Amino acid sequence: TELALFSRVNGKFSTEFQRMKTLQVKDQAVTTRVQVRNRIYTVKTTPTSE
């Protein structure tokens, strides 16, 4: 704002508002599943066992 009255009375009025905002969200979800199953032999009793 500027105001000059009678070419003698001067006035100035300068304002400034500045707002900056910042947000950051970072999510990670890692899921690992490993499953091993070995079946080698099938052991049975001989039917003639005692």
Binding site: T1, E2, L3, A4, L5, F6, S7
Partner: peptide, 8 residues
Amino acid sequence: LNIVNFKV
């Protein structure tokens, strides 16, 4: 005319 100068 050099009497009032009002600038916004």
